[PDB]
Motif scaffolding. Sequence first.
Motif, short mmCIF file in Angstrom:
data_model
loop_
_atom_site.label_atom_id
_atom_site.label_comp_id
_atom_site.label_asym_id
_atom_site.label_seq_id
_atom_site.Cartn_x
_atom_site.Cartn_y
_atom_site.Cartn_z
N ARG A 171 0.79 -1.24 0.00
CA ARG A 171 0.00 0.00 0.00
C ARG A 171 0.81 1.26 0.00
O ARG A 171 0.44 2.20 -0.73
CB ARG A 171 -1.04 0.00 1.14
CG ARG A 171 -2.10 1.12 1.08
CD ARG A 171 -2.99 1.02 -0.15
NE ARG A 171 -2.45 1.72 -1.32
CZ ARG A 171 -3.16 2.12 -2.37
NH1 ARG A 171 -4.47 1.89 -2.43
NH2 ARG A 171 -2.58 2.78 -3.37
N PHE A 172 1.81 1.32 0.88
CA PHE A 172 2.61 2.52 1.05
C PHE A 172 3.94 2.53 0.32
O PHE A 172 4.78 3.39 0.59
CB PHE A 172 2.72 2.92 2.53
CG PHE A 172 1.35 3.22 3.12
CD1 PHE A 172 0.77 4.48 2.97
CD2 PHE A 172 0.62 2.23 3.78
CE1 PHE A 172 -0.51 4.74 3.47
CE2 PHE A 172 -0.66 2.50 4.29
CZ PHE A 172 -1.21 3.76 4.14
N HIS A 173 4.10 1.61 -0.64
CA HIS A 173 5.27 1.63 -1.51
C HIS A 173 4.94 2.59 -2.66
O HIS A 173 3.90 2.44 -3.31
CB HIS A 173 5.59 0.23 -2.06
CG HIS A 173 6.96 0.20 -2.66
ND1 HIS A 173 7.21 0.69 -3.93
CD2 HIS A 173 8.12 -0.18 -2.08
CE1 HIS A 173 8.53 0.60 -4.08
NE2 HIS A 173 9.11 0.07 -3.00
N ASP A 174 5.83 3.57 -2.93
CA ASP A 174 5.61 4.57 -3.97
C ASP A 174 5.45 4.01 -5.39
O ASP A 174 4.96 4.71 -6.28
CB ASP A 174 6.73 5.65 -3.92
CG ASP A 174 8.11 5.14 -4.28
OD1 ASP A 174 8.49 4.04 -3.81
OD2 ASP A 174 8.82 5.84 -5.03
N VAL A 175 5.87 2.75 -5.62
CA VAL A 175 5.75 2.16 -6.97
C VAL A 175 4.85 0.90 -6.97
O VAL A 175 4.06 0.69 -7.90
CB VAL A 175 7.15 1.74 -7.54
CG1 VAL A 175 7.02 1.10 -8.90
CG2 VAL A 175 8.14 2.91 -7.59
#
Length: 316
Positions: free
Chosen positions: A238-242
């Motif tokens: 969810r909170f991974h930029d990619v």
Amino acid sequence: GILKTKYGFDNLYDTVISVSTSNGNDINELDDPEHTDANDRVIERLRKENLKFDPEYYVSEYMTHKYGNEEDLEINGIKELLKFTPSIVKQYLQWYKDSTNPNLVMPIEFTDEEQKQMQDNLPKKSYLVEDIKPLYVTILSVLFSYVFEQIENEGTHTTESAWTMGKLCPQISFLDQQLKQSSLIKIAIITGIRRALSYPLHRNYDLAMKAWTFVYYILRGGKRLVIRALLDIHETFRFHDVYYVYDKVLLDDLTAWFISQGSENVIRSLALEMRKEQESLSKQDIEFECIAEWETLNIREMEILAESEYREQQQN
């Protein structure tokens, strides 16, 4: 190659993955995600896995584990990884040891953090999916990815956590829920092992099997314990930029559909069936094909040839 080929949960998604490849999505392994049909994804995955596998790296890991000195073993970490028990498994085992009715499902009280996650991050729509078997196989494969990553990092979130899980999951790396071009369960277990022997930092068959053993116990815990694992996986992406794109195309719906429609019977039968299939396997079932022309070897043959070379080297 003109019509777009849909993918992800219930084949409802498109475009997202190609756009992500322009934004640094290095988990995707498909050359052309928007124009590759399900059967062609299996053909491409199988060819690429055979190309990716590195026998020298595989046998080096095996030799470090079996014959490495203290320094070799310290920097590698394999023995430490093999002693680790993920927190989710410890939760099951702590409940199980004291259970008066061990065939039942493990009771779960979702934490405030898990409740907020389900309320704020998951879709609220209702589901009417008829073809559920690929979804339960996706749960089996993603639980393997998740457990493997929990072991590899000894339960700590790292910069490599989402990548490792994505790489070990064919439904993510290759958008492949079909797997077959043995039972689908057995193929999913062999696929998890072959990818765990080709992609991650630690490539070790015993490590891959330890992860599958832990999957069995999480499944035995039941639907709510499986939800706890799916919520952890979903949060990592969810909170991974990619890599959040894998929540958009697969994990958002897989988690929301499983919460509302998951079956305790299917999960229990899946726990018992996967354990049967896992137990029927040995190193002789794990084969790779390559040019030196073509040769197919099982991993045990590779180990023996490396042990023979080493023994001849230590003799001289």
